[model samples]
Target: MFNNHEIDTILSTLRMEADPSLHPLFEQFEKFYEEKLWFQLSESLTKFFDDAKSTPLRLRLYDNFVSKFYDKINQLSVVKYLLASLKDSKDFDESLKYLDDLKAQFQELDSKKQRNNGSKDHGDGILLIDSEIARTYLLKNDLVKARDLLDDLEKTLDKK
Candidate 1:
């Protein structure tokens, strides 16, 4: 929806937040946005918008980010946004619980939408759920479910 001038301005605004050393995700995102890579875009981010609700520009932004760095999703702000969005979405709780067969804290998280959308527009950092699911489980003193969730993710990816 942006004209060339508007796109240029948008890029300039975000450039202040860009850090090539940490998050090169935008590079990928921009390409995908320009090329319209839908599946690749959707796969990158955990939170998603239904076709009916998202604006064309928003949808384009979604595809760009999802396609470029679906696997390099290392920012916690992104996770927080993703989690919050998931909880807000109809299938919100789908990934909220770990199948731990051990000590379960079972702490409830907010289901309503939160501010910030966990934006890493500032190039902030975050802990990735995939890298430390086991560690997080141990931190919570629940090992069984941690393994279960990881196994579940592995299987899910494999099947796809």
Candidate 2:
């Protein structure tokens, strides 16, 4: 939707909240926007902010990317925004309950995946769910749990 000049103008100057590490992600966002790669763009944005490093960019990510490309985000990826916001905003107890709620939701869906596919491989849905949960623990500063969960996730990834 953005023309060359507009894109250049928008990206020309890095704002204070921006980080050097985020340049490639911003470029990819623009490219995906220009090419109308909505799904990829949405997924990319969701993935990038899972362990977000830039404070300023995260503030604008929803408006700059998600809102602008809302049509591209599926229900599955939509939950990432809530996770990101909650991770940043909630206190330990609040985060604990909220994440458990989210995990319960994930487990419910995962059961459906398991039931439908039986022994068939259903790709990375479970992995992503696990990753999000691990990310939640990391955000909460529960490094021990995060590391343990990540170890489990790694083992599963290696197996698959």
Candidate 3:
């Protein structure tokens, strides 16, 4: 949905403000976004975020760009990018709330899939969100909650 001129401005800003070494990565982002290659763009953005230099722009990129076409890419990858952006924030409560919302959304989607396909498996997406919830609890120093969630997650994994 982004216009080419808008995308160009975004890339130019990132190139100027972020690490110089990230220039090629930004170029790839521009190319992918312009070509409407959502999967490639998602992967490129993920790689960009993996750089320590991109930490400051993580939330900005997610909000302004990634969020726009997130549905067109892998849901799990979108969750991962969202998690990275949320981790940049100091407010653990906000992060936990977002994680819980994501978990609910995925659970609903899983139920729909089960109904349509006769599948009973809980998707890895839910597990990933739960782990992130536990992590937020840990960041908030809610050790009891974190431990309980981790214990549940361990049981879930053991059963798999």
Candidate 4:
């Protein structure tokens, strides 16, 4: 969907914005995403996000990803995998907010999965939702509510 000029500009921008430690990986993401190699891009980016040493670098990388690809990233078959990777970002509190936004966006998909014959059962689905809620509470620095939700989630899982 991008032209040569756009690609060149993006490359330059990435170089300008990239942290010293993450520049190489930024270039790698540039190549994969530019080529529409979504799977590879997601895999490599996910790994990088998971393993990055600096929270600033992780947030920067995530910002770069969202800037370059978030518009269309949700349409891909591998979006969930990408989201899972994003949810694993180093900034737990910030990451939780992003994760919450993502989970909200995917509620429809979650419902669809619930309707499918072989997907996660209704209880499993509830667990996923509750997990997000508990994570949000925990990330918001409210350990009490988070613990309560965790306890409830555990009970729900057992019954379901």
Assess each prediction's global lDDT (C-alpha) against the native.
0.36, 0.56, 0.69, 0.53
lDDT of 4 by residue, 1-160 (tens): 3325765765676566556776777677777867877667776666555654433444444444544554444333223343454556545565556655655555545564446655544334335744865765654553333565665433323233
On lDDT, the candidate that comes out on top is 3
What TM-score quantifies how close candidate 4 is to the native fold? Answer: 0.51
Predictions: Cα RMSD each: 16.6, 10.2, 6.5, 7.2
Winner on lDDT (2 vs 4):
2
Model 1, residue 97: displacement in angstroms? 25
Decide which is better by TM-score, 2 or 4: 4
- Per-residue accuracy of model 2 over 10-65 as CA lDDT, tens digit each: 55543335677777777776788678788777766776666567643543454344
Two-way TM-score contest, 1 vs 4, winner: 4
Tens-place lDDT per residue, model 3, 1-160, is: 4456766676777777787888788787788888888888888877875777766566666567766675556667767666776877677687788767766766766765554453455566677778868866755562343465665433312234
Candidate 2 stretches greater than 4 Å from native: 1-16, 90-160
Clashes of each: 6, 0, 0, 0
Q: Model 1 — which ten-residue stretch has the worst lDDT?
A: 101-110
Positional deviation of residue 155's Cα in model 4 after best superposition, in angstroms: 19
What lDDT score is found at residue 95 in candidate 4?
Answer: 52
What TM-score would you give candidate 3 relative to the actual structure?
0.69
